[PDB]
Structures are given as C-alpha cells and as structure tokens.
Amino acid sequence: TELFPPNLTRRYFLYFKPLSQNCARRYRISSKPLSVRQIKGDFLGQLITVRGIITRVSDVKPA
Amino acid sequence: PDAVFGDRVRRFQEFLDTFTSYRDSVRSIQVYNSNNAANYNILPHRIIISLDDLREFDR
C-alpha cells in the first residue's frame, strides 16, 4: 500500500502577479523595475521583476 | 581562553574611548535608514577607525 504523492494528480499549475499601480500610492514597493546591476544583495530568494532584452531562445523540451 | 582573552577584554574597555567621536557616527548613519525604509512612499556598515585614535595612547 502506497498513497499517491500529491504531485501525481494535479493537471494544473500556479502563478503570481505583483502590483505597481496607485494602490502602492494608496497605503503601505516589491515591484519597482530594478535593473540587473543592483540586484546581488538581499534580493536572493525573493520576487523581483526586471526589464531587459531577451536573447538565446532555446527549444521546448520535456522535463 | 584566559591569556588569549584577557587583553581582548582590557582592550574592550580601552577602545570605547577611541570611539568617543564615532559612537555618534555609527548610530546617526542608521537611524534615518531605519526611518526612510519605514516611509519610502541603503548604506553599508563602514566604521572608519583612524590611526590617530589608536596611536596617541595605546602602544
């Protein structure tokens, strides 16, 4: 007897989406478009957005 | 430790006068960094010890 590990029956994913609207100017940041240059500090293990230019597109492979 | 720790502690009472002029400095640099971070709507921990405060009276 072995129960299902929870990863078997999902057939779905999760996603997230931050904010940079006047709700940040309502009352209180985590979604200012910081560049790549100033990012090496305590920003490791967080949620940060960065703008850029996408290069080196690989293909789609099954994991 | 007593031999390798004793002149630590005797210095631990000694250099506290060698930041009479910096014990203001080390807290003034953070109190606004604590302030602005609470009202956003930034400096590292630099404690410049000069020679002069450690050569005039400790040999």
Side-chain angles (χ1 to χ4, degrees):
Chain A
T1 312
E2 174 57 56
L3 79 157
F4 295 156
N7 212 16
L8 271 158
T9 316
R10 300 188 188 275
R11 307 166 325 249
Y12 86 111
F13 310 98
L14 271 175
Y15 281 126
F16 275 74
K17 177 61 208 173
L19 58 96
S20 276
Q21 208 64 38
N22 304 322
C23 170
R25 213 56 165 178
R26 278 178 68 199
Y27 59 95
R28 150 75 204 93
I29 291 93
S30 180
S31 160
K32 300 287 182 281
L34 274 302
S35 92
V36 317
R37 184 69 263 177
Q38 56 276 33
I39 210 63
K40 206 189 195 74
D42 55 352
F43 324 103
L44 320 176
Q46 302 202 51
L47 155 75
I48 305 101
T49 189
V50 193
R51 58 191 55 203
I53 287 95
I54 278 179
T55 52
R56 294 300 228 276
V57 178
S58 90
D59 268 329
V60 182
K61 272 82 57 185
Chain B
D2 283 348
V4 77
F5 190 49
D7 201 81
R8 314 199 231 182
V9 189
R10 271 304 293 117
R11 217 161 163 156
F12 293 169
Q13 294 107 24
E14 168 55 65
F15 47 65
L16 44 83
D17 200 85
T18 78
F19 39 82
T20 47
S21 58
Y22 320 130
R23 68 160 317 280
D24 49 352
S25 81
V26 298
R27 52 105 166 170
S28 40
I29 59 173
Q30 59 159 350
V31 282
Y32 77 104
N33 292 320
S34 77
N35 280 315
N36 51 64
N39 291 116
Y40 278 147
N41 283 261
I42 209 72
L43 298 191
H45 293 166
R46 291 293 95 209
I47 313 99
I48 291 193
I49 288 186
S50 175
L51 255 65
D52 185 40
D53 222 349
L54 202 64
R55 203 186 73 257
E56 291 291 330
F57 49 90
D58 289 301
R59 292 308 279 161

